[PDB]
Design a protein around this ligand. Structure first.
Ligand SMILES: COc1ccc(C(=O)Nc2c(Cl)cncc2Cl)cc1OC1CCCC1
Ligand SMILES: [Mg+2]
Ligand SMILES: [Zn+2]
Length: 330
């Protein structure tokens, strides 16, 4: 279904006064509250980020095709508490800061940077607020296909299907100005990156990045592809790297989405992990401190020390946020 001029214009009128979408302290929550059309403000933010990068122009992507693409993506996000359009616009904004404030763009081609910013916006398409384990536990029809065809990444394959669908329309094909090996690389790297966001692949992903970083000269292509995967993963788990009040609001949203999954599991009589169990009754800080200690702090420290020195602020902020969660526990 084609994007209309009227849908484009409602995005184009958002001027985002008092916001700098390129800054590491940018507050998407404040942006959403700033008007009564937060879906338009979010789309404008994505649009300004992509155009501001100078990348779509270089790869033959018109302003209009870019905006159509952003709006086709937006239509395929659901009204779930966390994995909605605001999460992927956030991931897009965050990756922009890693590339340009954290100087990770130096490690990548311009095309790879363009693909990363585009891929941020597709990477969770039509998320329903249930994780891969739910579909597997319940033998949902919606994930029988995945296991039957040799992959457990039910959601991520689904996101890729839909990204390909959006891009198949010339009106929203942001890769339509590419040809040959470049067009092929855009699609392949986009899909590799989305598939790599499955946290069941987190450990192997991180360890494959660290290996290629320790020896970049031996296989440049591999290092480029792994750097893209790790930066999309970094954007995806970046909530704990933000100013505390922003970080706390993301944590509230993730937790509500998890609890809704847990409630559906109780309805089905299947297993509910404590992290998903509304009845255990919080507290927010305990879950955050745990996620920081066991997942997020070691991830950012390892990728920063290995390679990505310009992203040191992520480690600093994680440390800071952890201390604040400790104070909230009294
Ligand atoms: C804002 O705090 C969190 C942010 C993100 C995630 C998280 O697991 N995100 C994620 C998910 Cl849920 C699925 N695939 C990839 C990723 Cl990165 C998890 C977070 O904390 C959870 C909630 C209680 C402990 C873990
Ligand atoms: Mg995902
Ligand atoms: Zn995501």
């Amino acid at each position: 279904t084609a994007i209309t001029k009227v849908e484009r214009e409602a995005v184009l009128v958002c001027e985002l006064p008092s916001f700098d979408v390129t800054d590491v302290e940018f507050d998407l929550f404040r942006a959403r509250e700033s008007t009564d059309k937060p879906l338009d403000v979010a789309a404008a933010i994505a649009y300004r980020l992509l155009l501001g990068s100078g990348l779509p122009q270089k790869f033959g992507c018109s302003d209009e095709v870019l905006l159509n693409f952003i709006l086709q993506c937006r239509k395929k996000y659901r009204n779930v508490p966390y994995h909605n359009f605001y999460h992927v616009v956030d991931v897009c904004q965050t990756i922009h800061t890693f590339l340009y404030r954290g100087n990770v763009y130096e490690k990548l081609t311009e095309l790879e940077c363009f693909v990363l910013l585009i891929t941020a916006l597709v990477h969770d398409l039509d998320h329903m607020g249930l994780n891969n384990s739910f579909y597997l536990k319940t033998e949902s029809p919606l994930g029988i296909l995945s296991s039957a065809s040799g992959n457990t990444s039910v959601l991520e394959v689904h996101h890729c299907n839909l990204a390909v669908e959006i891009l198949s329309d010339p009106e929203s094909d942001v890769f339509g100005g590419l040809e040959g090996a470049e067009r092929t690389l855009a699609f392949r790297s986009m899909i590799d990156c989305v598939l790599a966001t499955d946290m069941a692949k987190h450990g192997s992903a991180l360890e494959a990045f660290l290996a290629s970083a320790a020896d970049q000269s031996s296989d440049e292509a591999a290092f480029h592809r792994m750097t893209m995967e790790i930066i999309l993963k970094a954007g995806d788990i970046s909530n704990v790297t933000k100013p505390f009040d922003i970080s706390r609001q993301w944590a509230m949203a993730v937790t509500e989405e998890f609890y809704r999954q847990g409630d559906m599991e109780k309805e089905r009589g299947v297993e509910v992990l404590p992290m998903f169990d509304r009845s255990k009754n919080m507290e927010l800080a305990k879950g955050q401190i745990g996620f920081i200690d066991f997942v997020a702090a070691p991830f950012f420290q390892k990728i920063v020390d290995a390679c990505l020195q310009g992203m040191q602020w992520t480690v600093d902020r994680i440390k800071s946020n952890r201390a604040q969660w400790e104070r909230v526990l009294e």
